[PDB]
Design a protein around this motif. Structure first.
Motif, PDB file in Angstrom:
ATOM      1  N   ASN A 289     -11.843  10.209  -6.341  1.00 49.67           N
ATOM      2  CA  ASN A 289     -11.115   9.014  -5.960  1.00 49.67           C
ATOM      3  C   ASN A 289      -9.445   9.462  -6.439  1.00 49.67           C
ATOM      4  O   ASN A 289      -9.301   9.659  -7.402  1.00 49.67           O
ATOM      5  CB  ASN A 289     -11.406   7.799  -6.559  1.00 49.67           C
ATOM      6  N   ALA A 290      -8.635   9.465  -5.588  1.00 47.51           N
ATOM      7  CA  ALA A 290      -7.187  10.157  -5.826  1.00 47.51           C
ATOM      8  C   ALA A 290      -6.591   9.327  -6.842  1.00 47.51           C
ATOM      9  O   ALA A 290      -6.536   8.143  -6.875  1.00 47.51           O
ATOM     10  CB  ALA A 290      -6.194  10.355  -4.604  1.00 47.51           C
ATOM     11  N   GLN A 291      -5.891   9.957  -7.921  1.00 43.66           N
ATOM     12  CA  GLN A 291      -5.322   9.459  -9.060  1.00 43.66           C
ATOM     13  C   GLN A 291      -5.999   8.247  -9.766  1.00 43.66           C
ATOM     14  O   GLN A 291      -5.457   7.498 -10.470  1.00 43.66           O
ATOM     15  CB  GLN A 291      -3.842   8.802  -8.607  1.00 43.66           C
TER      16      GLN A 291
ATOM     17  N   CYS B  49     -15.763  11.090   7.981  1.00 45.76           N
ATOM     18  CA  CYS B  49     -14.551  11.369   7.141  1.00 45.76           C
ATOM     19  C   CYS B  49     -13.619  10.221   7.250  1.00 45.76           C
ATOM     20  O   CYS B  49     -13.044   9.675   6.260  1.00 45.76           O
ATOM     21  CB  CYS B  49     -13.827  12.624   7.544  1.00 45.76           C
ATOM     22  N   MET B  50     -13.072   9.783   8.582  1.00 48.36           N
ATOM     23  CA  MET B  50     -12.321   8.589   8.711  1.00 48.36           C
ATOM     24  C   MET B  50     -12.893   7.285   8.257  1.00 48.36           C
ATOM     25  O   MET B  50     -12.263   6.844   7.482  1.00 48.36           O
ATOM     26  CB  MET B  50     -12.096   8.499  10.423  1.00 48.36           C
ATOM     27  N   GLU B  51     -13.980   7.075   8.320  1.00 46.68           N
ATOM     28  CA  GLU B  51     -14.966   5.778   7.557  1.00 46.68           C
ATOM     29  C   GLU B  51     -14.659   5.829   6.132  1.00 46.68           C
ATOM     30  O   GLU B  51     -14.294   4.744   5.867  1.00 46.68           O
ATOM     31  CB  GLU B  51     -16.471   5.876   7.941  1.00 46.68           C
ATOM     32  N   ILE B  52     -14.728   6.809   5.462  1.00 44.83           N
ATOM     33  CA  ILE B  52     -14.645   6.893   4.127  1.00 44.83           C
ATOM     34  C   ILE B  52     -13.330   6.799   3.582  1.00 44.83           C
ATOM     35  O   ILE B  52     -12.899   5.965   2.666  1.00 44.83           O
ATOM     36  CB  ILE B  52     -15.296   8.174   3.610  1.00 44.83           C
ATOM     37  N   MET B  53     -12.355   7.402   4.194  1.00 48.23           N
ATOM     38  CA  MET B  53     -11.101   7.424   3.816  1.00 48.23           C
ATOM     39  C   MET B  53     -10.481   6.024   4.022  1.00 48.23           C
ATOM     40  O   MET B  53      -9.784   5.321   3.413  1.00 48.23           O
ATOM     41  CB  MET B  53      -9.986   8.202   4.649  1.00 48.23           C
ATOM     42  N   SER B  54     -10.773   5.447   5.271  1.00 50.41           N
ATOM     43  CA  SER B  54     -10.285   4.104   5.523  1.00 50.41           C
ATOM     44  C   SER B  54     -11.076   3.118   4.595  1.00 50.41           C
ATOM     45  O   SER B  54     -10.094   1.921   4.106  1.00 50.41           O
ATOM     46  CB  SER B  54     -10.994   3.603   6.930  1.00 50.41           C
TER      47      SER B  54
ATOM     48  N   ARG C 276     -11.782   3.767   1.361  1.00 50.81           N
ATOM     49  CA  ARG C 276     -10.955   4.062   0.028  1.00 50.81           C
ATOM     50  C   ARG C 276      -9.497   3.632  -0.056  1.00 50.81           C
ATOM     51  O   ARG C 276      -8.882   3.175  -1.051  1.00 50.81           O
ATOM     52  CB  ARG C 276     -10.989   5.521  -0.429  1.00 50.81           C
ATOM     53  N   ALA C 277      -8.702   3.542   1.264  1.00 48.57           N
ATOM     54  CA  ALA C 277      -7.770   2.705   1.451  1.00 48.57           C
ATOM     55  C   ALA C 277      -7.514   1.365   1.425  1.00 48.57           C
ATOM     56  O   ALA C 277      -6.869   0.724   0.717  1.00 48.57           O
ATOM     57  CB  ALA C 277      -7.085   3.400   2.754  1.00 48.57           C
ATOM     58  N   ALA C 278      -8.482   0.710   1.759  1.00 53.06           N
ATOM     59  CA  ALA C 278      -8.795  -0.572   1.990  1.00 53.06           C
ATOM     60  C   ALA C 278      -9.392  -1.297   0.618  1.00 53.06           C
ATOM     61  O   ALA C 278      -8.928  -2.344   0.337  1.00 53.06           O
ATOM     62  CB  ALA C 278      -9.743  -1.107   2.872  1.00 53.06           C
TER      63      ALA C 278
ATOM     64  N   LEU D 175      -1.655  -0.952   1.672  1.00 48.58           N
ATOM     65  CA  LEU D 175      -2.746  -0.077   0.984  1.00 48.58           C
ATOM     66  C   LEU D 175      -2.298   1.119   0.433  1.00 48.58           C
ATOM     67  O   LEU D 175      -1.092   1.566   0.999  1.00 48.58           O
ATOM     68  CB  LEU D 175      -3.544   0.252   2.216  1.00 48.58           C
ATOM     69  N   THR D 176      -2.849   1.759  -0.239  1.00 48.54           N
ATOM     70  CA  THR D 176      -2.351   2.919  -1.077  1.00 48.54           C
ATOM     71  C   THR D 176      -3.192   4.089  -0.575  1.00 48.54           C
ATOM     72  O   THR D 176      -4.326   4.367  -0.644  1.00 48.54           O
ATOM     73  CB  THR D 176      -2.406   2.677  -2.526  1.00 48.54           C
ATOM     74  N   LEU D 177      -2.509   5.332  -0.061  1.00 49.73           N
ATOM     75  CA  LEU D 177      -3.074   6.331   0.594  1.00 49.73           C
ATOM     76  C   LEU D 177      -2.927   7.434  -0.553  1.00 49.73           C
ATOM     77  O   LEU D 177      -1.586   7.720  -0.982  1.00 49.73           O
ATOM     78  CB  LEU D 177      -2.516   6.767   1.955  1.00 49.73           C
TER      79      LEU D 177
HETATM   80  C1  LIG Z   1      -7.116   6.168   6.871  1.00 48.28           C
HETATM   81  C2  LIG Z   1      -6.259   7.285   6.176  1.00 48.28           C
HETATM   82  N1  LIG Z   1      -6.549   7.195   4.703  1.00 48.28           N
HETATM   83  C3  LIG Z   1      -5.859   7.938   4.044  1.00 48.28           C
HETATM   84  C4  LIG Z   1      -6.250   8.113   2.487  1.00 48.28           C
HETATM   85  O1  LIG Z   1      -5.255   8.712   1.882  1.00 48.28           O
HETATM   86  N2  LIG Z   1      -7.022   6.999   1.915  1.00 48.28           N
HETATM   87  C5  LIG Z   1      -7.011   6.663   0.533  1.00 48.28           C
HETATM   88  C6  LIG Z   1      -8.084   7.573  -0.346  1.00 48.28           C
HETATM   89  O2  LIG Z   1      -8.598   8.287   0.287  1.00 48.28           O
HETATM   90  O3  LIG Z   1      -7.815   7.637  -1.299  1.00 48.28           O
HETATM   91  C7  LIG Z   1      -4.906   8.805   4.545  1.00 48.28           C
HETATM   92  O4  LIG Z   1      -4.184   9.959   3.577  1.00 48.28           O
HETATM   93  C8  LIG Z   1      -4.774   8.836   5.697  1.00 48.28           C
HETATM   94  C9  LIG Z   1      -3.728   9.825   6.462  1.00 48.28           C
HETATM   95  C10 LIG Z   1      -3.526   9.736   7.685  1.00 48.28           C
HETATM   96  C11 LIG Z   1      -4.369   9.006   8.580  1.00 48.28           C
HETATM   97  O5  LIG Z   1      -4.214   8.847  10.078  1.00 48.28           O
HETATM   98  C12 LIG Z   1      -3.231   9.600  10.516  1.00 48.28           C
HETATM   99  C13 LIG Z   1      -3.763  10.869  10.741  1.00 48.28           C
HETATM  100  C14 LIG Z   1      -2.779  11.914  11.318  1.00 48.28           C
HETATM  101  C15 LIG Z   1      -1.322  11.359  11.846  1.00 48.28           C
HETATM  102  C16 LIG Z   1      -1.095  10.011  11.604  1.00 48.28           C
HETATM  103  C17 LIG Z   1      -1.958   8.999  11.023  1.00 48.28           C
HETATM  104  C18 LIG Z   1      -5.300   8.093   8.005  1.00 48.28           C
HETATM  105  C19 LIG Z   1      -5.358   8.183   6.745  1.00 48.28           C
END
Ligand SMILES: Cc1nc(C(=O)NCC(=O)O)c(O)c2ccc(Oc3ccccc3)cc12
Lengths: 235, 11
Positions: A23-25, A92-97, A99-101, A111-113
């Motif tokens: 989990n980032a940072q 991948c998208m599911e899990i990043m969403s 963790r961002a949420a 939200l923090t990315l």
């Molecule tokens: C949905 C999500 N999340 C994170 C993220 O860091 N989540 C927090 C974490 O994983 O700790 C991203 O960095 C994203 C970057 C791009 C993205 O779409 C795009 C991809 C390419 C171009 C524009 C948007 C969705 C992200």
């Protein structure tokens, strides 16, 4: 109601540790984090390219963290390499969403990315996500009543990774057994955790919410050289 | 395909 068996505690610990390690940072994320300057990510009069440039910059380290998570699970590591790829493009998208949420901040509506970039709903929508931005921001707004801790977020991520649903899988049956191990251990943890919310049917609806978020790979999709190649590989 | 995702998995 039934609480974790001894083998599920071993399971919970391993999955939890996989998540904290990736989990980032980690715990600093709300201090290291910086707000995107708010001139970026306004309504074009298609897609804003400056917002878009930042999101491709952080997509690749973010995909990478998800790969580090699955590789810390002995269950994922004994799959054939072809299956791990299919499993990884699908979650991948599911899990990043997710963790961002869990990193929603209502005092800011961000939200923090990547543990460092706080982004408002409009910035993320205009950077390319569109309606999927409203979807993710809805999840984080609705998750704040659920009060998920590190292991619940981790078990969520495990249920999404182990989807025998994805097309092309050789070990469909094996993948279905691992997810049931996680699904059982997740409920038993929910029982013991005694949330004050009909918790568990509601959580299963949030899993569906994420899968929908994931199923919009094509309804999301600037020339292909503009996307980082690791992003092109999982979308 | 997937030449870099494959590399990260066997890393
Ligand atoms: C949905 C999500 N999340 C994170 C993220 O860091 N989540 C927090 C974490 O994983 O700790 C991203 O960095 C994203 C970057 C791009 C993205 O779409 C795009 C991809 C390419 C171009 C524009 C948007 C969705 C992200």
């Amino acid at each position: 109601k039934p609480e974790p068996t001894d083998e599920e505690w071993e399971l919970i610990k391993t999955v939890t540790e996989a998540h904290v390690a990736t989990n980032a940072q980690g715990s600093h994320w709300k201090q290291k984090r910086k707000f995107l300057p708010e001139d970026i990510g306004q309504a074009p009069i298609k897609v804003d390219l400056e917002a878009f440039s930042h999101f491709t910059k952080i997509i690749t380290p973010a995909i990478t963290r998800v790969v580090d998570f699955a590789k810390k699970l002995p269950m994922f590591c004994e799959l054939p390499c072809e299956d791990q790829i299919i499993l990884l493009k699908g979650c991948c998208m599911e899990i990043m969403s997710l963790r961002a949420a869990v990193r929603y901040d209502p005092e800011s509506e961000t939200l923090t990315l990547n543990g460092e970039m706080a982004v408002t709903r409009g910035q993320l929508k205009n950077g390319g996500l569109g309606v999927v931005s409203d979807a993710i921001f809805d999840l984080g707004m609705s998750l704040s009543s659920f009060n998920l801790d590190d292991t619940e977020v981790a078990l969520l991520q495990a249920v999404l990774l182990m989807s025998s649903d994805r097309p092309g899988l050789a070990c469909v049956e094996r993948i279905e057994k691992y997810q049931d191990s996680f699904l059982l251990a997740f409920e038993h943890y929910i029982n013991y955790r005694k949330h004050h919310v009909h918790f568990w049917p509601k959580l299963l609806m949030k899993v569906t919410d994420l899968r929908m978020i994931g199923a919009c790979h094509a309804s999301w999709f600037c020339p292909t050289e503009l996307f980082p190649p690791l992003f092109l590989e999982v979308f | 395909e997937n030449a870099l995702l494959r590399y990260l998995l066997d890393k």
